[PDB]
Amino acid sequence: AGQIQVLEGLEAVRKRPGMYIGSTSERGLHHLVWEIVDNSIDEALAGYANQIEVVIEKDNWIKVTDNGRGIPVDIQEKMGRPAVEVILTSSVVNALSQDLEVYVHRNETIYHQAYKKGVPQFDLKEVGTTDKTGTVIRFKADGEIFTETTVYNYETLQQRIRELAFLNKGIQITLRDERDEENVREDSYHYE
Ligand SMILES: CCNC(=O)Nc1cn(-c2ccccn2)c2cc(-c3cccnc3)cnc12
Ligand SMILES: [Mg+2]
């Protein structure tokens, strides 16, 4: 019943996306970023993370990284599925992404899963080792949903990242634009 209730949730989000993110215009596209960054901010307010990085990659992929505990990977009681899977299959940003990847650094291990329109493409896998902890999410907004534009505006992202760092003192938040490999722009904010 749990996996079924996942699938229906994905269908609900993709059918009426503006009811979930306000709009499917440029404002809604940027809201994707905010939803991811807010969870990293919670991890910092919980006392675990202090660095967040937002990268505009080639072809308008977004990469968000935090140095928190890593979204958990233990098998759930209620879903029979890894915890990270449960959280990402319940995610609006994942449902509204043509593709999304997660890498978790936790338990000295790197775990990876990829999704399309919220649907896992394979079971969570151990891909490497690490001596760090944290979460990386990389997603590509679905152009079937975001029919006006899938191009992010650096200044929009910059303004709000600066605000978030000034509000959440102590967290280092970095924005980087790598869309033109010949001219990479970075702003990094860290108050008090
Ligand atoms: C790059 C975007 N990064 C994230 O989304 N980071 C997190 C979201 N979540 C999260 C968890 C639940 C619901 C929604 N989001 C977390 C939970 C934990 C966590 C909690 C308890 C023990 N160990 C780790 C740690 N990082 C996260
Ligand atoms: Mg949220």
Domain residue limits at 74: 1-192
Q: Pick the ligand that lies closest to the CA of residue 85.
A: 1
- CATH number for the domain spanning 43: value is 3.30.565.10
Q: What residues are paired with 53 via a beta bridge?
A: 65, 174
Q: With 0-12 CB in 10 A as exposed, 13-18 as middle and 19+ as buried, what is 47?
A: exposed
Q: Pick the ligand that lies closest to the CA of residue 92.
A: 2
Decide: 95 and 24 in contact? Cβ < 8 Å.
Answer: no
Cβ neighbour number for residue 10 with a 10 Å cutoff: 20
Lookup: tokens for 5: 């209730």
In the chain, how many domains are there? Answer: 1
Lookup: tokens for 2: 């749990």
User: How far is ligand 2, taken at its centre, from the CA of residue 29, in Å?
Assistant: 14
From which experimental method does this structure derive?
X-ray
Cβ–ligand 1 contact at 73 (below 6 Å): no
Q: Which pairing describes strands 109-116 and 185-189: parallel, antiparallel, or unpaired?
A: unpaired
Cβ–ligand 1 contact at 56 (below 6 Å): no
- Between CA 27 and CA 187 the distance in angstroms is 21
Burial 70-107 (b: 16+ CB within 10 A, else e): bbbbeeeeebebbbbbbebbbbbbbbbbbbbbbbbbbe
Q: Which pairing describes strands 51-56 and 172-177: parallel, antiparallel, or unpaired?
A: parallel
Cβ–ligand 1 contact at 39 (below 6 Å): yes
This structure's resolution (angstroms)? Answer: 1.5
* Full DSSP string of the chain: -HHHHHHHHHHHHHHSHHHHHS-SSHHHHHHHHHHHHHHHHHHHHTTS--EEEEEE-GGGEEEEEE-SS----SBPTTTSSBHHHHHHHT-HHHHTEEEEEEEEEETTEEEEEEEETTEESS--EEEEE-S--EEEEEEEE-TTT--S-----HHHHHHHHHHHHHHSTT-EEEEEE-SSTTS-EEEEE---
- Dihedral sign of CA atoms 129, 87, 141, 134 in order: negative
Decide: 21 and 33 in contact? Cβ < 8 Å.
Answer: no
